[PDB]
Amino acid sequence: VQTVTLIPGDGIGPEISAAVMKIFDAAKAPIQWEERNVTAIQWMIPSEAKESMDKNKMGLKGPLKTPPSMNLLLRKTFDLYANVRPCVSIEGYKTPYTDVNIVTIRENTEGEYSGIEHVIVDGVVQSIKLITEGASKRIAEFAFEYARNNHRSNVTAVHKANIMRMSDGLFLQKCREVAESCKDIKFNEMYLDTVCLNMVQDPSQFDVLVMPNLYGDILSDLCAGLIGGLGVTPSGNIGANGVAIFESVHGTAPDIAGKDMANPTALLLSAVMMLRHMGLFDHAARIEAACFATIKDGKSLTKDLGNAKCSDFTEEICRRVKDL
Amino acid sequence: RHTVTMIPGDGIGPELMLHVKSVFRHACVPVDFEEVHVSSNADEEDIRNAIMAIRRNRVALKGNIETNHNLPPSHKSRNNILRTSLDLYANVIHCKSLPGVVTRHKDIDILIVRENTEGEYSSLEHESVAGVVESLAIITKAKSLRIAEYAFKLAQESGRKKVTAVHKANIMKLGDGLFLQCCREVAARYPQITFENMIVDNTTMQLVSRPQQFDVMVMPNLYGNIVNNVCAGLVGGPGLVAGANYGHVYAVFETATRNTGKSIANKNIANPTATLLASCMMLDHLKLHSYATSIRKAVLASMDNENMHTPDIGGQGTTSEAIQDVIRHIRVING
Ligand SMILES: Nc1ncnc2c1ncn2[C@@H]1O[C@H](COP(=O)(O)OP(=O)(O)O)[C@@H](O)[C@H]1O
Ligand SMILES: [Mg+2]
C-alpha cells in the first residue's frame, strides 16, 4: 500500500475526487490518500502540502480557480519540467477523429513562462523570452525515456526553426543528440504548421510529439480537441526528485459546483496515468477498461457527453471494475 | 495587357507555374509573366532584384522558396524577407468546404486575415550567455490597427456578419492586449459587424469540433500561421487553398499553406487547384474579373468530379489530367 497527495481543488473538484476515490476503493488498488489543500500564502505553497508531496512523491489534482497562479507555484516548487498529455479516441465518445493515439511532451519551465513584456514606445510592445540548452536537453532525454518506457515507436520534434533559427534550432540540436543515443526510437522533425495541417487530416500518422514552450501549449489543446475536449483529457507533470503530479486540465465548473451533474473521466484517466507511472499496471488497465466499457454502453453517460447523474456513472464503473 | 512578376520557387512551384501559363493561354488572359528566380542563396542581390520586379509590376504570383533551417541564423527566410520588405501586411486566405471534396466537416466558410510582418517573424534572437537564446519580438499599434481595419472592411464588402479576433491576451497581456484593443477600436466604427474574440488555444479546439461557428477571423502573425494550416486541413489540405499577401500598393499571390512540396515534385501528382485559384485571386486584383470567373468556375467544376482528384485528396489522377479537365471546362463556357 502507498500514499498519494490528493488536491480536490474548487468547484466540481471535490465531487469528482470522491468519485475517483470510490472507484480506486472498489478496485482494491494499493493506494490510500492524504488529502491536502493548496493556497498561495506569504509567496509560496502551504507547509503541509509541500511536505505531503515531498514524502508521497506523487500527487493527483482537480481543477483550481485562478486568484500568482497555483499551477505556477506547483511548477516552480517541484521543478515540474515536463508536461505530458496522452490523447486517445474514446470508443463510446463520438468525434470525427477516431484513429487518435498521440502523446504530447511539452517543456514546462521556460519559453513563454520566462515571459517579460514592456512598452518600448507609445504603441509598441516588446516581449522577451528564453530558451536554454539545459532545459532543451532535459525535455529531449525525457521524451525518449517516456517513449521507451511506454512502448512508443516514433518521436517527432515539433518546431519553427525556419523562422526561430537560434532558439528552435537549439531545441532541435539537443533532440538530435538524444536521438543519436536512443537509435531504437524512430525520430523525425516537422514544422509546427505542417504538424497542424496534417494533424486535422490524419492524426494517426503521429505518435509522440516533443516540443518547447516558446509558443505555449496550443498543440496540446488541439490534440485534446480531436478526442472530445479537456473534459476527457488526462494530463501529468514530471518534476525533479522523482516528483510527479497528475491532474485534470478542465475548468472548475462553478455553475454546477454543488449539483450531481459532473463528469470525472479526465481526473480518473490522469489517476490511471499515475498508477502506470508508479508501476501499478494491472489496476491501471482494469480501471481504464472499466471506464471505457462504461462509456461505450451509451445508456449511462453524464449530461455533457445523456441525462444520468455523476454517481450513477461512477457506480456503473465500480460495478464493472469488480469483474476482475 | 498587364505584366505580372512570376517567382517559380522551389519544389512543385515551377511545374505548377507551367500549368498556370498553359491555362491562361487557353483562356486568352491578357497577362504576361516576367519570371524572376530566387535561389535560397547565400547572396541577396537576387531577392533585392525580385523586390524591384514586384515594385515595378505591382503584382506577382509566386511559388514557395524553401528555407534551409540547418543554415546559420544570418541566413533568413527569403519568403519572409520578400513579404516584409514589400510591407505586404495582410495575409488573407479563404477556406470554404468544396462539395466534391469530402472531409470530416462541411459548411465551412472562413476568411482569415493575418498580420504578415511583425511578431516572431521580425524578432531578434541572441545568445549573449552560452546556452541561453533570448528572443525579442515586437507587436505594434499601427500594424494591429491596419490589419483590423483590413479585416472589418473585407467583412463589410463581402457581406459577412462577424469578425473574431484570435489572441492570447490571457498570457501576453500587454502585446496581445494591445492587438485586441486595436480590433475593438476599429469594431466601434463597424457597428453592423458582430465582434467577438477567442483565445488561440480555445480557437483550435473549436475548429476541429465546430468550425462552422467562424466567419471572419483576424489575428497576429504566429496564430495566423497555425489557424491557416488548421483551416486549410479541415477543407481538404494544402492542394486546395489560395493565399494573398496585400500591401497598400503591392500584392503577391501564392498557395495558402506556403508549402514547397519537395517530396511530391516532378511526379505529375501535385494538386494544381490552390495555385490556379491563387492566379484567379490575382486576376480579380487586376480587374480581370470575367477571366478569373471563367477559370475559378472551371477548377471548381473539375474538383466536383472525384475522377479528377489527385492523391492528396484521395484521388488517383495526375496533375496534367486535372489541368486537361479545367481547360475542357473553360472551352465549354468559352464558346
Ligand atoms: N499542391 C499540393 N498537392 C499535393 N500535396 C501537397 C501540395 N502542396 C503541399 N502538399 C503536401 O503538404 C505537405 C507540405 O509540406 P512541405 O512540402 O514539406 O512544405 P514546407 O517545406 O514549406 O514545410 C507535403 O506533404 C506536401 O506533399
Ligand atoms: Mg513553407
Numbering used by the authors:
A (entry chain A): 4 to 45, 51 to 75, 81 to 318, 320 to 338
B (entry chain B): 15 to 349
Structure paper excerpt:
Isocitrate dehydrogenases (IDHs) are a family of enzymes that catalyze the oxidative decarboxylation of isocitrate (ICT) into α-ketoglutarate (α-KG) using NADP or NAD as coenzyme. The α and β subunits form one heterodimer (αβ) and the α and γ subunits form another heterodimer (αγ), which are assembled into a heterotetramer (α2βγ) and further into a heterooctamer (the heterotetramer and heterooctamer are sometimes called holoenzyme). Our biochemical data demonstrate that the αγ heterodimer exhibits similar enzymatic properties as the α2βγ heterotetramer and can be positively regulated by CIT and ADP, whereas the αβ heterodimer has only basal activity and cannot be regulated.
To investigate the structural basis for the functional roles of these residues in the allosteric regulation, we took the γ-K151A mutation as a representative and determined the crystal structure of the αγK151A mutant bound with Mg2+, CIT and ADP at the allosteric site. In the αγK151AMg+CIT+ADP structure, the structure of the allosteric site is very similar to that in the αMgγMg+CIT+ADP structure with the CIT, ADP and Mg2+ binding to the allosteric site in similar manners and maintaining almost identical interactions. In addition, accompanying with the conformational changes of Arg97G and Tyr135G, the N-terminal part of the β5G–β6G loop and the N-terminal region of the α7G helix at the heterodimer interface also undergo similar conformational changes as in the αMgγMg+CIT+ADP structure. Specifically, the hydrogen bond between the main-chain amine of Glu134G and the main-chain carbonyl of Asn235G is disrupted and the side chain of Glu134G is inserted into the space formerly occupied by the N-terminal loop of the α7G helix and forms a hydrogen bond with the main-chain amine of Leu236G. As a result, the β7G strand has no conformational change, and consequently the β7A strand, the β5A–β6A loop and the N-terminal region of the α7A helix also have no conformational changes and adopt similar conformations as in the αMgγ structure.
